[PDB]
Design a protein around this ligand. Structure first.
Ligand SMILES: O=c1cc(-c2ccccc2)oc2c(O)c(O)ccc12
Ligand SMILES: O=c1cc(-c2ccccc2)oc2c(O)c(O)ccc12
Ligand SMILES: [Mg+2]
Ligand SMILES: [Mg+2]
Lengths: 294, 294
């Protein structure tokens, strides 16, 4: 079982050599804020030269895929295809397209708590949004899902409206992710989707369907058009309760990097408590430590 | 132990006869919205004639005591003294006065998520509020508590500011109550303080000190200036997880009335699960059924 081993030396060469690809979390792993982790671009160049696949998975719903791709480029991660990038905004849009209730001749609408990147992904997946213009008649389409994402304009009034839609038990409640908070450059924090979802769940008495990590649905989304054997995929993340748990639920070897949210002492406390699904198989100080294994 | 018995007949006469007073929840018990429960004013008149004390305890922080007293009068509950009325706004103000950290020569301020009734109670207890004017110097007083109450103007920005104050581990986190939602006249619901507290707790990683029912602190607040033996006090409420649990924690005989939030079938499900602290000793269809026991 996972034992939180510092990955180095021959073990590092063997782990990377057997892996067919690496699935990276983004925030706290490749970068912090607008600062790339030193050595991270060089790791990705060496992985490619070694013929290993690289895929990326983020619970951040700020950027639709085109704006996410440009961010990778800007921070030194060249040569990437947009098809390698998976965010909770993209995967939430796809899940709603796959699962929205209602008849095909009278499609429903999604009431969205979230920002313009998230809304852009929803529309690109064909979803109609509550508040969008009504047809000439004026009869607004029925709301058949509430989607909670990172919403800098969250308000009591929006929370109460979500509850009104959720009075219909057939209306879905979906959340992009459950991350509770995110660190800012000065050591402060900003509230995360999980804090807003907690309010929506508590007021409505409903449990949300979570799209993002640690839900295995995110691995379904990533693998819809790319064949990756989870038994041959390394999952690299900074957050025990999202990235590492995700990896265990999907059957991947997990690596905690220490440049982000979770601390080594937390992983060790989970191991001492026997909570092995929150323990990484391996850790590194930063992902630059992986390059030597190639 | 509590067995959820319908209270009637000789048992009703004995239970009321042995009681020295009755502690009533307000919303869902005395009234629904702006409609008084039929017979409820007459019960309170008969209790007084019988020499039994009546006290009132609400988690609603909309009304400071003067506006709460006028509401009782308007709905037919005459002859009451404001000193009989205890809301989570009043008791939160008193708790903050008793527990606010900081030196006596440089008192702190309270960052409040809540409305004007709540703020009025805080000021009447001597508390200074974040955002109040600064002294001539301009140096704003340090925020030493965050208070979450029912906040119709809750926003992501206010949530993020609360988190900034809570970065100081000595800054208290207090909530007026944890009620998750409240029913409206048309069967919709409005979010409750517990939904907002859930967001604040989740984003900050803190657990709130809850003032209102089911916290026993509310019974400390009620009894500060009135001597009531809990062993001789009947607790009458409509909400299992707040009023009935409160009664059990304080050692009172509990009565569920069915004119409000909780349903008889819920109480029976808790009893079948052995969760006796959420089971009322007795129930009535409405508190008008108690009058015959006098
Ligand atoms: O999902 C989001 C996550 C974050 C985030 C902020 C700091 C560190 C890590 C993640 O910021 C966002 C944001 O600024 C938006 O406008 C919209 C969405 C998000
Ligand atoms: O604490 C409060 C509880 C409620 C409430 C609403 C419906 C049924 C029962 C309780 O409404 C409030 C309100 O409208 C305010 O403006 C301020 C505070 C509250
Ligand atoms: Mg991360
Ligand atoms: Mg009540």
């Amino acid at each position: 079982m996972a034992r939180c081993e510092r990955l180095r030396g021959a073990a590092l060469r063997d782990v990377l050599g057997r892996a067919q690809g690496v699935l990276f979390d983004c925030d706290g792993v490749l970068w912090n804020g607008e600062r790339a982790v030193p050595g991270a671009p060089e790791l990705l160049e060496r992985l490619a030269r070694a013929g290993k696949a690289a895929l990326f998975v983020s619970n951040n719903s700020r950027r639709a895929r085109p704006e996410l791709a440009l961010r990778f480029a800007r921070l030194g991660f060249g040569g990437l295809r947009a098809e390698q990038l998976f965010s909770s905004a993209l995967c939430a849009a796809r899940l709603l397209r796959q699962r929205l209730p209602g008849p095909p001749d009278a499609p429903g609408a999604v009431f969205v708590l979230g920002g313009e990147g998230l809304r852009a992904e929803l529309r690109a997946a064909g979803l109609r949004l509550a508040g969008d213009p009504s047809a000439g008649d004026g009869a607004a389409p029925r709301v058949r899902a509430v989607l909670v994402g990172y919403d800098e304009h969250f308000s009591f009034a929006k929370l109460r409206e979500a509850c009104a839609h959720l009075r219909d038990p057939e209306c879905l409640l979906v959340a992009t992710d459950r991350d509770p908070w995110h660190p800012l450059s000065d050591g402060s924090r900003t509230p995360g989707t999980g804090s807003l979802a907690a309010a929506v769940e508590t007021a409505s008495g409903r449990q949300a369907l979570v799209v993002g990590k640690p839900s295995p649905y995110m691995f379904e989304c990533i693998t819809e058009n790319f064949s990756i054997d989870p038994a041959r995929t390394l999952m690299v993340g900074d957050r025990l309760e999202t990235d590492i748990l995700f990896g265990h639920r999907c059957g991947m070897t997990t690596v905690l990097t220490l440049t982000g949210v979770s601390r080594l002492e937390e992983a060790q406390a989970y191991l001492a408590a026997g909570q092995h699904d929150l323990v990484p198989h391996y850790y590194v100080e930063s992902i630059a430590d992986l390059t030597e294994g190639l």
